[PDB]
Amino acid sequence: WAMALTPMEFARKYNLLRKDDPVPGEEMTAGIEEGDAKRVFTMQLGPYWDGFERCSPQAYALSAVFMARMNRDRDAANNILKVLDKTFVDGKPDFSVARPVMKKYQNSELVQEVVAKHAYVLTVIASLLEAAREDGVVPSSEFLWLKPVDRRLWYMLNCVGRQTPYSEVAGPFAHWKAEKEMGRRSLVPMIDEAIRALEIAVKEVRLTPRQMEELEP
Amino acid sequence: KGPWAMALTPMEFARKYNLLRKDDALLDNPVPGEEMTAGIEEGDAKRVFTMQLGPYWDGFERCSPQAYALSAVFMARMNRDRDAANNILKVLDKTFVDGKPDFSVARPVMKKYQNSELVQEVVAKHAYVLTVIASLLEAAREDGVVPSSEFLWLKPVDRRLWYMLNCVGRQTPYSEVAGPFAHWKAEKEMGRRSLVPMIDEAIRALEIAVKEVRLTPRQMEELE
């Protein structure tokens, strides 16, 4: 199973660590290259929302599920989930099953309110899931097949309801939270909370002498 | 092709394990409706399907952790304990989000039901882990739907078990579990467990599936 990177693993994967320095108790600790971190987190944000037709198939179909739930149509929702489970078992899932439900609910009032308030596919669909959860539980485990289909989406949706995201979606999570705080959609990335949380998490972790000697300035 | 590759079709299976050969009955006496098809090397096929049977059942403690935990879920259902079952499935689901799974969660349930009458009856009648657990799933389904959906998490941990369990309730199995499927059915038809592999039906079925597929001339010449 393909585990989420820790903060330190993430920093190391994207070459974000830096010789910081001398804060007593911070011996054998690294800093973060903020500019590079900004770029990584900006890339994580993914595409602008620009009509559901342009979402990936998986983002489209799960959006449809959540919209159906927002509109109290559990049957339409469970039918997608069921076909996707069955057809995913059978070897490649039928994301077209969601199209009728998209057509019915994409301009419904509650959906239009979510789309109006978020600029990115990932922040739109997070708020669709948050909103669907006023109807019922809607766990990650209704859509287990998404992990191998779309890792970034899987992690974003598993962070809805959580206070701290996985580092691999900390950018879109920070942005989503910033959009809610601003009370409008934002095209300008608002990912500064991801940078500060990475720095904090990375400074908790001691490096080996070998690791410290690798730190570039 | 990754931990999530699609199931091999019969023809792909026969090619991966080098089971295709020239059909010497059709070479020496051709039939007009049957040109351009291959036969199966039956010796090698018996080996491959026997290799799919997996280990003998020899107490649940010796099963793979996934086989242990799913047996426990099915056991609970056979004994009408949906909550103990669902508790395992919940906890397993939780751990696959980001981590590695808590198969430990199944231990209390296995303790409680492994010597229950209905479990004892399944274990008595099947000799292999795969055939026991197939029958436990089949029995668990008298209590409710127990779809494979709910353990999609299995496919990356144990390909063979996942396909085996998705064939319970099917008439034709995937080629990659045709051996233990054939065995399982043979046990049910004999009315006892069988340690001797009973996989001949998987060989017959492969030959029949392979005869449906026309090869190209180039493919026909490359046969041995």
Swiss-Prot record, chain B:
Changing R62E: Results in a significant decrease in replication in macrophages. Displays lower levels of effector translocation. It comes from the Bacteria. Its main location: membrane. The keyword Protein transport applies. Keywords: Cell inner membrane, Cell membrane, Membrane, Protein transport, Transmembrane, Transmembrane helix, Transport, Virulence. It is found in: Cell inner membrane. GO terms for biological process: protein transport. GO terms for cellular component: plasma membrane. Component of the Dot/Icm type IVB secretion system (T4BSS), which is used to inject bacterial effector proteins into eukaryotic host cells. Part of a subcomplex which recruits effector proteins and delivers them to the core transmembrane subcomplex. Forms the interacting surface for recruitment of acidic Glu-rich motif-containing effectors. This is Type 4 apparatus protein DotM. It comes from Legionella pneumophila subsp. pneumophila (strain Philadelphia 1 / ATCC 33152 / DSM 7513). The chain holds residues 156 to 379 of 380 of the full protein.
